[PDB]
Structure 1
Amino acid sequence: RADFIQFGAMIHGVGGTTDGWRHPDVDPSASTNIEFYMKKAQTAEKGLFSFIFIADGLFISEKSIPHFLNRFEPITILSALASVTKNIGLVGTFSTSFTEPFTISRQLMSLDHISGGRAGWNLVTSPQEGAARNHSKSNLPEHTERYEIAQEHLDVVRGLWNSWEHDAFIHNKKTGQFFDQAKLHRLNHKGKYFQVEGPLNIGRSKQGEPVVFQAGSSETGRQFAAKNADAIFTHSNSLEETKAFYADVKSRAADEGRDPSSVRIFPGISPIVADTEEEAEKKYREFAELIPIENAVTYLARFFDDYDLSVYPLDEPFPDIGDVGKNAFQSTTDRIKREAKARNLTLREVAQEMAFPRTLFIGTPERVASLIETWFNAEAADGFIVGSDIPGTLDAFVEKVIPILQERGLYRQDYRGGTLRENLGLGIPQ
């Protein structure tokens, strides 16, 4: 391909699982540990990653995963990371549901100035229902209305970012003209959900304004992202599904009058790289074995409801149970039955793999680089957002996979520039 592949690094504290933090290598305080976040950010920058990504959440219970219980908030951790990094982008999740767009617009643009033009906004339209009750609302608006709110919120945020033209600040000490008043613009916005006069009290950044990311998956969300986003996150459940998503979103973007190459699609992967196939599998198994087996069998039991799995000896082959019946997730049960037979899995192993599935992107650096190249050449991805919950995985990826991609001409030898737009290959608007 003519362009280069890009990577982002999701920094996610003690990770996305219930029990991964119990591994001997995991620092259980990682989610509020500034050293952990700084070290991961600098590892990603060493790998020339275009950005780091901080997810977010606004509602928890006693059953939330450990990372969700106690974690940094995104604009603060990204601003702190700006001071100890140089070129890597800083992408944070903020919802359109609660905060006023003037506040979000200021905070993102301020990060964009602090960082020299590296800010990005992952826009979330639909938080958990319970989040409404943390923000003085009885309930969230309905799906359709949440996307109308999000469109108006984003329009106001981008309108405010353009309050000042890029050359508005003359700073002429001799004449006393600090700014050119013809280059200052009030928004004067009076919409259904927001009324915002302006102007914003911060000007254009070195990349013009922050980059917008979105992870819309529904019909409505795919269309919203194709209309509005610079980059789109998606899943990597299969090459076929991701290829279909990519083609659909790129087509929708053309329908909206955009150049499809200006929308960069980033599936999420969590690769497990080791020097040998067996070593990588051993690392996967160490983490899959952390789940309390009774919890995994109980969750497995949801797909074989007509049986008590407790009578089956754990360390014997998975039973030829399953029959047919009919459950809302029955095609799941036949994939489970087929995999268990294909690899002669025990009941314990089936339970463990269901609680923590094995990534396709597992094995030698050469295999993982080749898979990544294949997805890139197949137009399933313009890049990947790399998770690294298992300790050492980001370091292994940067040290071992990146040099192969560089040697094959798919990855740059150094940063293209100092702004997120430049490193993603986007133009800067004014």
Structure 2
Amino acid sequence: RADFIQFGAMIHGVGGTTDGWRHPDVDPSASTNIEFYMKKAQTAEKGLFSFIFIADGLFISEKSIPHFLNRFEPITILSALASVTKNIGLVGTFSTSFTEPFTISRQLMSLDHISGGRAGWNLVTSPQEGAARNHSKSNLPEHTERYEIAQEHLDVVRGLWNSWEHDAFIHNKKTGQFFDQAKLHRLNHKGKYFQVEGPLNIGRSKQGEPVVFQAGSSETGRQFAAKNADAIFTHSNSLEETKAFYADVKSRAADEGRDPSSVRIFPGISPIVADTEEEAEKKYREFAELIPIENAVTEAKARNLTLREVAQEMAFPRTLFIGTPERVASLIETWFNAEAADGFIVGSDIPGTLDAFVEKVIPILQERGLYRQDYRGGTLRENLGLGIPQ
């Protein structure tokens, strides 16, 4: 293809499972360990990853997975990581359901100034139902209303980001003109869900404004993303399903009046890379064996599997993206050439995974001309190949 493949790294502390933290190599304090986050972010930057991504949640119980129980909040960890990284994007999850757009707008834009234009927002419309009860609401609005709220929220945030024109700040010491009064704009927004006068108290960043990510899978969500998002997350359950998703969203984007290339689609994968097929499989099995068989308590596949093995694989499915660097690189290239992906969000809970990917897979993709030799620029937009709106 004309373009290069891009990667993001999801940094997810102790990981997305119930028992992975029990592995010898895992630091069970990882989710609130600043060194862990800094090291992963710097590994990702070593591999020229376009961004890091911090997922989020707003409600837990005593059955929540260990990572969810005790973890960094996204804007704070991303701002901290901004000071110890150079070119890599900083993408954080924030919901439209509870926080005022003025607040979100400022925090994201402030990160964008701190980072020299590397901020991104993963916009979540539909948090857990319990989250409502952590934010002085009896319940969440219904699905349709959540997307209506999210549109207005987004509209306010982007309107606030355009309070100041990019060249509004003249800073003329002689005349005493600090800014050009014609280049300041009040939002004066009076909507159903939000009323926000403006102006915002921070101007344009080096990439204009933060990039917006979205992960909608429903018909409503796909359409919302197609209309609004710069980049879209999705799953990698099968090449077929992901191809279809890709084509459908790109088509919806065209229907909304947009150039499909301005919407970048990133399926999520968690690859297990080793020097041989056997080593890779051994790593997988070591993690799959961490679950107490107990959840045998929790599909025609003749691979001579025992009940134990079947139980373990249901608890922790084996990725397709497992094996040698050559295999993993080839699969990635195939998904790319098949238009199932513009890039991938790489998960790396198994220790060594990100490092192995950066050290072994990236050079193959470079050699084949599918991945750049260095960063294109210092902003997220530039590295994703997006334009600055303004």
TM-score past 0.5 threshold: yes
Give runs of aligned pairs for residues 364-383 of structure 1, distance below 5 A.
Answer: 364-383=324-343
Larger Rg computed on CA atoms:
1
Give the Cα–Cα distance (whole angstroms) in 2 for the partners of residues 7 and 226 of structure 1: 20
Give the Cα–Cα distance (whole angstroms) in 2 for the partners of residues 285 and 40 of structure 1: 24
Post-superposition CA distance 1:140-159 (Å, at most 9, x none): 00000000000000000000
Alignment pair present for 1:360 and 2:338: no
Post-superposition CA distance 1:52-76 (Å, at most 9, x none): 0000000000000000000000000
Give the Cα–Cα distance (whole angstroms) in 1 for the partners of residues 226 and 130 of structure 2: 28
Decide whether the 8 Å contact of 1:296 with 1:354 is kept in 2: no
TM-score, with structure 1 as normaliser = 0.90
Change (3 A) 1:296 1:32: farther
Post-superposition CA distance 1:232-263 (Å, at most 9, x none): 00000000000000000000000000000000
Q: Secondary structure at the match of 2:105?
A: helix
Give the Cα–Cα distance (whole angstroms) in 1 for the partners of residues 300 and 346 of structure 2: 28
Unaligned runs of 5+ in 2: none
Q: Percent identity?
A: 100
Give the Cα–Cα distance (whole angstroms) in 1 for the partners of residues 53 and 217 of structure 2: 19
Alignment pair present for 1:200 and 2:195: no
Change (3 A) 1:133 1:374: same
Q: Secondary structure at the match of 2:258?
A: coil
Deviation at 1:342, TM superposition (A): 1.8
Change (3 A) 1:118 1:340: same
Deviation at 1:348, TM superposition (A): 0.2
Q: Secondary structure at the match of 2:300?
A: helix
Post-superposition CA distance 1:365-407 (Å, at most 9, x none): 0000000000000000000000000000000000000000000
Post-superposition CA distance 1:25-51 (Å, at most 9, x none): 000000000000000000000000000
Change (3 A) 1:129 1:341: closer
Give the Cα–Cα distance (whole angstroms) in 2 for the partners of residues 140 and 16 of structure 1: 25
Decide whether the 8 Å contact of 1:207 with 1:428 is kept in 2: yes
The alignment covers a number of residue pairs equal to 389
Give the Cα–Cα distance (whole angstroms) in 1 for the partners of residues 57 and 305 of structure 2: 36
Q: Secondary structure at the match of 1:134?
A: coil
Give the Cα–Cα distance (whole angstroms) in 2 for the partners of residues 264 and 166 of structure 1: 25
Deviation at 1:341, TM superposition (A): 4.5
Deviation at 1:296, TM superposition (A): 3.8
Change (3 A) 1:19 1:296: farther
Decide whether the 8 Å contact of 1:38 with 1:84 is kept in 2: yes
Post-superposition CA distance 1:156-179 (Å, at most 9, x none): 000000000000000000000000
Q: Secondary structure at the match of 2:301?
A: helix
Give runs of aligned pairs for residues 2-401 of structure 1, distance below 5 A.
Answer: 2-297=2-297, 341-401=301-361
Deviation at 1:340, TM superposition (A): 6.1
TM-score, with structure 2 as normaliser = 0.99
Give the Cα–Cα distance (whole angstroms) in 1 for the partners of residues 293 and 307 of structure 2: 10
Decide whether the 8 Å contact of 1:340 with 1:350 is kept in 2: no
Give the Cα–Cα distance (whole angstroms) in 1 for the partners of residues 119 and 345 of structure 2: 16
Change (3 A) 1:35 1:171: same
Give the Cα–Cα distance (whole angstroms) in 1 for the partners of residues 323 and 142 of structure 2: 43
Decide whether the 8 Å contact of 1:253 with 1:259 is kept in 2: yes
